[PDB]
Design a protein around this ligand. Structure first.
Ligand SMILES: N[C@@H](CCC(=O)N[C@@H](CSSC[C@H](NC(=O)CC[C@H](N)C(=O)O)C(=O)NCC(=O)O)C(=O)NCC(=O)O)C(=O)O
Ligand SMILES: N[C@@H](CCC(=O)N[C@@H](CSSC[C@H](NC(=O)CC[C@H](N)C(=O)O)C(=O)NCC(=O)O)C(=O)NCC(=O)O)C(=O)O
Ligand SMILES: [Ca+2]
Ligand SMILES: [Ca+2]
Ligand SMILES: [Ca+2]
Ligand SMILES: [Ca+2]
Ligand SMILES: [Ca+2]
Lengths: 209, 210
């Protein structure tokens, strides 16, 4: 396969790029890194920023989950139709990463005491994505433009993991709700999301969700 | 009138790198300044996509997210690598810059007193990947990716400048980063901008800490 994904046995920051690859019919190899192997230190020391994911595209080695998403976006034509739409794609993805950031901070550093405040704040954090859908073909296509982009895969994962954290959190948002259903029904993606490759990995590395 | 408008607090902050980019590229822009009082009134904030600044206008294109603005100017002004592989390396650098900027912002705004010594102790391990990247590209003598400037250079340069204010001499451990700061800061239009009142008379951050 042209691609290799190197990561812990978790969905985490590789979930969206895996959905992208599956949906696009691309083949890849998973190199699973155990925490025992990670704690040994040598792989970590070799990583540019001492972190995973690490990704290989033939001779090219990449780090940074959003670098991997933008690279796949660029090379597979999942980055909008022109420079103006590419900027809108980036603006969506940077917004997804900000909330993913907040989610990861809750999960790994403050889950027991901070979940109440997080869930209370969540509608205000999701509403921008509903507003963006409402301004693009009535929400009937994708988050930017009329073709899928890497930002759609990242937003879709963000929405899925938030439905597990806070069940019902999309019920006030009809366009986000319909978008989750529509993209989740794309045949290759539907098959991936139902497969044990996806279903039998935990969302996060500490067993919280 | 200029095609660009930057809408921000009277701070360098997350606009410093994109302003350096615009000035070094000889582009004109308008600064729209937002006071704390205006921000607190709430109307502008409610109208912002994610409730935050910067906001950037390029004609009728309205953008938010500082790295979105950097990438957009990187596309439209040809500062995004020579091909697809280089563009990915440019992203990889910028995402690393943003991760450390993140940590810097968290120190400055939420934990300066108690956290500064720990931060400064961790800092060489956080700067070293950028020294390593320079060492692997033409011996560190040109740019952070490839042989032409990219938006990631302006963001990294800003990152390095504010860390020298936070931890003077921190680049003494990193000869290629140190020479790089000096070199890029000497580019004539950028040198002029960095010396000018419109840069020097803004604070680095919004809370008076640096
Ligand atoms: N920007 C990079 C981030 C990559 C990243 O964070 N990788 C993590 C896994 S997902 S991140 C999962 C978890 N993150 C956190 O615990 C961060 C929570 C809080 N907000 C904080 O800033 O400390 C974590 O593993 N943090 C790492 C740590 O602090 O030790 C990793 O490799 N960790 C191994 C390591 O660093 O040794 C990307 O997008 O890929
Ligand atoms: N991802 C966006 C970030 C934009 C952003 O953070 N904008 C800030 C100014 S620079 S950021 C400076 C400062 N950060 C902090 O106070 C805390 C940083 C820590 N990591 C945390 O998240 O808790 C801050 O203003 N945090 C926002 C806040 O809590 O009000 C803003 O508009 N704030 C006004 C607002 O939100 O109302 C981008 O890249 O442009
Ligand atoms: Ca394998
Ligand atoms: Ca396409
Ligand atoms: Ca339902
Ligand atoms: Ca324009
Ligand atoms: Ca160029």
């Amino acid at each position: 396969p042209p691609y290799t994904v190197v990561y812990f046995p978790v969905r985490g920051r590789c979930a969206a790029l895996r959905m992208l690859l599956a949906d696009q019919g691309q083949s890849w190899k998973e190199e699973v890194v155990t925490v025992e192997t990670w704690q040994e230190g040598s792989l970590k020391a070799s990583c540019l920023y001492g972190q995973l994911p690490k990704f290989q595209d033939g001779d090219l080695t990449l780090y940074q989950s959003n670098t991997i998403l933008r690279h796949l976006g660029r090379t597979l034509g999942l980055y909008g139709k022109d420079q103006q739409e590419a900027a809108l794609v980036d603006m969506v993805n940077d917004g997804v990463e900000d909330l993913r950031c907040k989610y990861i901070s809750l999960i790994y550093t403050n889950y027991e005491a901070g979940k109440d405040d997080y869930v209370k704040a969540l509608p205000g954090q999701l509403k921008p994505f509903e507003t963006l859908l409402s301004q693009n073909q009535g929400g009937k296509t994708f988050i930017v433009g009329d073709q899928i982009s890497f930002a759609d895969y990242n937003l879709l994962d963000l929405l899925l993991i938030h439905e597990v954290l806070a069940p019902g959190c999309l019920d006030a948002f009809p366009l986000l709700s319909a978008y989750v259903g529509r993209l989740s029904a794309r045949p290759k993606l539907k098959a991936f999301l139902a497969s044990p490759e996806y279903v039998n990995l935990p969302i996060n590395g500490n067993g919280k969700q």
